[PDB]
Nucleic acid binder design. Structure first.
Length: 231
DNA sequence: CGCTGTCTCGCT
DNA sequence: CGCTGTCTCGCT
DNA sequence: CGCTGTCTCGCT
């Protein structure tokens, strides 16, 4: 339980509906407002008229707010994948992760094959390719991925398979940005092949980790440690 | 994802 | 498709 | 470098 960073200001909202995959309508202080959604997943378990969400204002654009997360067991599940990215950057920088206790980000969205992976990190040892994925689909004590078929996600895992096999370091970090979870596993029904490809990748030396994060009402983003991975 | 309009399922 | 926001191109 | 205008990218 380390404090990673704070989101300010942070406002409770009532979720009304999605206008489209990038925009939700929320009610804040009697007013109806448009909120950016940065998470391509379905989030059907979260995106239900009436549930309490949490937003933060921004300047400009076609939306005045960013929908960051939802009430979940008294705290906050973080659905915003840019915020998840920042919390992961902070983890690296502060060296709170055992696998990377002295490393730095040298490139973001570095090109591999005909795709782009998330990070190129530099260890004391050598070069490492880290891809992150949002795991906010719950089953009991498990945070899971995905909640729908991701053809983009298949090909990304393949690049990690094609890199590892061919003598390169390749990692995948599932961000379990839910409170009250201690394990990760893939949701087979969400995508049949990503389950398969995860074992295939796990066999080819591709490191697979999963982290536990939540947000408090204060806006405080908390890292809870690694989740037990069960690929 | 939600977008239109229409057409499809088993179990109660 | 258009939907957000921010990113990337060559040639002039 | 910034200069015009237009046309190009993946990921969210």
């Amino acid at each position: 339980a380390m404090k990673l960073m704070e989101v300010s200001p942070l406002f409770p909202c009532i979720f009304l509906r999605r206008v489209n995959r990038f925009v939700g309508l929320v009610r804040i202080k009697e007013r109806i407002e448009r909120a950016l959604i940065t998470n391509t997943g379905r989030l059907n378990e979260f995106m239900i008229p009436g549930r309490i969400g949490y937003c933060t204002p921004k300047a400009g654009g076609k939306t005045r707010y960013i929908l960051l997360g939802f009430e979940d067991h008294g705290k906050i599940a973080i659905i915003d994948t840019r915020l998840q990215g920042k919390a992961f950057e902070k983890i690296i920088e502060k060296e709170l992760l055992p696998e990377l206790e002295g490393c730095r980000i040298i490139k973001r969205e570095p090109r591999v094959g005909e795709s782009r992976l998330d990070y190129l990190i530099e260890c004391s040892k050598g070069e490492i390719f880290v891809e992150t994925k949002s795991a906010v689909l719950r089953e009991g004590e498990y945070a899971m991925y995905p909640d729908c078929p991701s053809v983009r996600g298949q090909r990304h895992i393949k690049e990690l398979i094609k890199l590892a096999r061919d003598g390169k370091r390749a990692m995948i970090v599932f961000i379990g940005a839910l409170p009250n979870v201690s394990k990760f596993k893939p949701y087979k029904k969400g995508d049949p092949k990503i389950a398969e490809l995860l074992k295939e990748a796990l066999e080819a030396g591709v490191e697979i980790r999963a982290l536990g994060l939540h947000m408090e009402l204060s806006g405080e983003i908390i890292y809870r440690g690694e989740l037990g991975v069960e690929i």
